[PDB]
Amino acid sequence: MKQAILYVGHGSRVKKAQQEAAAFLEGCKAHVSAPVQEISFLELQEPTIETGFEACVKQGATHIAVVPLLLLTAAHAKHDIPEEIARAASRYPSIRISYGKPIGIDEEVVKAVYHRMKDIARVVLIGRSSDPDVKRDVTGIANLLQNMIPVKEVIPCFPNYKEVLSEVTTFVVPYLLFTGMLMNEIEREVQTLKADNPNVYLSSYIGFHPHVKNAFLNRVRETAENPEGQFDFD
Ligand SMILES: [Co+2]
Ligand SMILES: [Co+2]
Numbered sequence: 001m002k003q004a005i006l007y008v009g010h011g012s013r014v015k016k017a018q019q020e021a022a023a024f025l026e027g028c029k030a031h032v033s034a035p036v037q038e039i040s041f042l043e044l045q046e047p048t049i050e051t052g053f054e055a056c057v058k059q060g061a062t063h064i065a066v067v068p069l070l071l072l073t074a075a076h077a078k079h080d081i082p083e084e085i086a087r088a089a090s091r092y093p094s095i096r097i098s099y100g101k102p103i104g105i106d107e108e109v110v111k112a113v114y115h116r117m118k119d120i121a122r123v124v125l126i127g128r129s130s131d132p133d134v135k136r137d138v139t140g141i142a143n144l145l146q147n148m149i150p151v152k153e154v155i156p157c158f159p160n161y162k163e164v165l166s167e168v169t170t171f172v173v174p175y176l177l178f179t180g181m182l183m184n185e186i187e188r189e190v191q192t193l194k195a196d197n198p199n200v201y202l203s204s205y206i207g208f209h210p211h212v213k214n215a216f217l218n219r220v221r222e223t224a225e226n227p228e229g230q231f232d233f234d
Contacts, residue, residue: 003224004036004061006052008081009069010177011041017178018045024208025069031213032220036061042076042084049081053088063096065224066233069216070102071109071177071206072138074131077102085233099233100223103215105140110148112209117171120201123154126161126186127175134158138175161186165193165200174205177212 007028009021025039036059040052047055056064066085068077082099089097103109117123125142128134135158142154157164158175165172172190176183183205190202206212223231 002036002060002062003034004038004056004059004064005032005034005220005224006049006056006064006066007037007039007069007220008049008052008066009039009041009045010076011043011045012178012180013044014178014180017180020178020208021045021069024213028213028217028220031217032224034065034224035059042080049084050088053085053092057092057095061095063098063224065098065100065220065226065231067100067216067220067223068102069177071104071175072128073102073104073133074129078131078133082233089233097233098223098226098231100219100231103212103219104137105144106215106218107144107148108211108215108218109206110141110144112206112211112215113145113173113175114149115209115211116173116203116206120171120203121151121169122171123151124161124164124170124172125154125156125158125175126172127156127158128182129158141175162189165189168199170197170200172200172202174203176205177207179205179207 007025012018029037036056038052038055040047040049068081138156138158142156146154174186
């Protein structure tokens with residue numbers, strides 16, 4: 001037996017984001033017991049999932065745990081990544097594959113939100129959607145945050161955040177792993193809003209806070225352990 005982890009990030013055009021994601025995934029390697037560990041990206045960034053999967057096989061992996069670096073379960077986790085993995089599986093039929101879940105609702109991510117907020121009551125949680133599983137997840141996370149600290153309310157916007165801002169101290173927490181255009185838009189809209197309401201405060205994005213890392217590594221470990229084959233990928 002020789003276990004591999006294939007990490008799958010979203011990928012990005014933005015230099016800083018490429019750096020944050022690649023340093024983050026390289027940092028994870030020292031925290032995971034598997035002898036073969038490879039990084040790949042769904043879009044824009046090298047290596048691709050194809051190359052990453054191939055890199056694991058080259059290194060003699062018998063088993064590959066594919067773990068998506070995503071905060072939520074929607075099209076990427078449910079459709080795009082597994083269809084790219086199935087191409088790989090057809091190329092390498094004797095590899096046993098397991099496939100993990102996005103972070104989702106995990107009290108560790110809530111701890112990251114607290115920490116980002118503590119770098120500065122209601123909370124406005126801004127993130128990425130038509131998929132209902134995203135509605136469930138973000139509502140879940142808002143309810144955990146709402147009860148883990150003494151805030152008045154938490155309002156997810158996954159509702160157009162622009163309009164929620166147009167409508168008591170308010171924290172705006174971007175529920176995003178990395179920076180980019182959306183983050184630049186939010187930064188701009190809050191910036192303008194501050195002139196109209198001075199009790200609005202924008203935190204940095206959750207990013208790769210150590211509590212996010214904890215949450216991710218819990219995903220990695222359950223996927224690689226694959227209890228009762230529940231993470232088996234066909
Ligand atoms: Co995307
Ligand atoms: Co399809």
